[PDB]
Amino acid sequence: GSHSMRYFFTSVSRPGRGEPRFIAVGYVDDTQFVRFDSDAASQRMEPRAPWIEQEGPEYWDGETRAVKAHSQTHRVDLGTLRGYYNQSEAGSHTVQRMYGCDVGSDWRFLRGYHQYAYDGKDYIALKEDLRSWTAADMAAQTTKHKWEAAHVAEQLRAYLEGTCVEWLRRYLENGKETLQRTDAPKTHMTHHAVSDHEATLRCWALSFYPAEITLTWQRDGEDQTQDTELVETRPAGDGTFQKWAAVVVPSGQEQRYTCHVQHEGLPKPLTLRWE
Amino acid sequence: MIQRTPKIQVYSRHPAENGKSNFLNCYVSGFHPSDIEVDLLKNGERIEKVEHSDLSFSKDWSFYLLYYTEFTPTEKDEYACRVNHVTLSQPKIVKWDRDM
Amino acid sequence: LLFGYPVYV
């Protein structure tokens, strides 16, 4: 089906404690495949998925060069932003950056992105036409005008429609066993007594990939949206994901409740019942 | 400036079975800024050999990290995750419940 | 593969 590749960059200034901390990670879909950490001993871009390890020293040398250059621009950006927002030398601040591309289920270019946040808040983003910029702040306007005059969006359009999706497709092919797989959720229910008159019914989905999933409870086929406790999908640590959804079931009423699981790895959606 | 509280889940990689080796995970997410302190506890004491994932972030810019250590559950041992962050006025401890 | 050109805010 559909796929994406994304790179995430965080830079955090540390006044009086040296250079800003910089961390870059890259993902294809929900699978991390590279990392750089400016505090770490190696100073190299490093593999985080087995399928990227057989790329070759030209790859590792080049990506280490490019990632270090990203670290350096963010190091300038922090000083630049502090100037724009008239902020003191003393505080720690955060620049985040994300870019990358989606392909549709034909594997052709679908959507491109490139956006920045400052201190947890949208700063500037490339619009979907990849030709113009969204900026909310007055300070961000200085950036927008700089980028318009330097034709950064033209440069980014070229990369997102060409190189970005070409390398996504290469990775999809090279990592076919890991990236073009699905792991269907292995499911179960638990039942714990709150008190004498009700019990919590929890529907579990475990070891699934990719992360996208819908877990819902119905009672006589009516959706129980407002009475369902739902936790955030969470990583198992081994490349799979986990989720649960729970409802409070009054005594004798277990039979009215169904849990509904939708996931790409399932041959049909599951309807589960405590029985 | 923007400060968002970490959500915290403490759990095992595989269904916990006594005597079988596993990973204990503390997942922290939705937080800003990124300086966070996360420890795994065994019977209240800091587990030394604890690793974390590489810092990354969601579409709304809030950070997430998985903290993890190898462990083999027993019937008696109690595990927990203790988190401190600027949004928290004291470290929040979440106990591992092998039904959650 | 990373974007190869410098961008400064």
Side-chain angles (χ1 to χ4, degrees), chain A residues 6-10 12 17 21 23-25 27 32 34-35 48 87 92-94 96-98 113 115-117 119-124 188 190 192 202 204 206 231-238 242 244, chain B residues 1-4 7-15 22-25 27-35 51-68 96-100:
Chain A
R6 292 278 186 277
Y7 280 107
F8 303 87
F9 306 93
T10 304
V12 171
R17 286 199 305 126
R21 172 103 181 231
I23 303 185
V25 298
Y27 278 80
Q32 204 206 325
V34 280
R35 68 140 172 224
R48 300 291 263 151
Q87 283 161 333
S92 182
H93 295 276
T94 302
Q96 288 155 283
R97 186 193 192 181
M98 176 277 288
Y113 304 90
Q115 46 201 53
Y116 275 75
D119 288 327
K121 175 177 215 231
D122 287 346
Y123 178 80
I124 186 159
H188 73 290
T190 61
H192 206 252
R202 182 169 289 111
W204 280 97
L206 294 177
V231 292
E232 169 155 49
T233 296
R234 68 201 196 183
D238 61 359
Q242 303 185 0
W244 68 251
Chain B
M1 82 186 37
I2 274 164
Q3 309 184 148
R4 302 190 192 282
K7 298 182 270 271
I8 299 166
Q9 304 193 58
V10 51
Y11 55 107
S12 57
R13 177 173 308 174
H14 297 276
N22 211 321
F23 286 76
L24 164 76
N25 295 327
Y27 183 52
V28 295
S29 68
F31 60 97
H32 219 280
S34 55
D35 280 22
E51 286 170 306
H52 56 84
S53 71
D54 308 317
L55 188 63
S56 184
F57 54 84
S58 291
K59 287 214 152 261
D60 63 6
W61 305 111
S62 69
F63 292 99
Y64 55 86
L65 287 166
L66 179 67
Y67 280 75
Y68 56 98
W96 181 53
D97 181 335
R98 56 160 105 198
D99 287 56
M100 271 158 184

Side-chain angles (χ1 to χ4, degrees), chain B residues 54-92:
Chain B
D54 308 317
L55 188 63
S56 184
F57 54 84
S58 291
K59 287 214 152 261
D60 63 6
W61 305 111
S62 69
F63 292 99
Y64 55 86
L65 287 166
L66 179 67
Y67 280 75
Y68 56 98
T69 185
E70 275 140 281
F71 89 129
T72 288
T74 57
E75 181 194 343
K76 300 326 240 283
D77 296 308
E78 292 165 84
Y79 292 91
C81 187
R82 173 180 66 206
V83 170
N84 208 181
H85 187 258
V86 246
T87 58
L88 294 172
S89 58
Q90 251 148 74
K92 179 49 165 213

Side-chain angles (χ1 to χ4, degrees), chain A residues 29-41:
Chain A
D29 307 325
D30 299 320
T31 295
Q32 204 206 325
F33 67 109
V34 280
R35 68 140 172 224
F36 181 78
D37 171 9
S38 72
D39 265 7

Side-chain angles (χ1 to χ4, degrees), chain A residues 189-193 197-201 217-220 247-259 272-275:
Chain A
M189 294 182 177
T190 61
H191 185 288
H192 206 252
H197 72 77
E198 64 193 25
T200 294
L201 224 42
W217 277 99
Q218 296 177 1
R219 173 187 75 189
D220 309 345
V247 282
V248 168
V249 175
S251 284
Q253 287 184 38
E254 282 82 5
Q255 108 216 306
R256 301 176 67 188
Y257 287 82
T258 47
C259 174
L272 302 189
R273 207 178 329 246
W274 184 271
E275 66 193 339

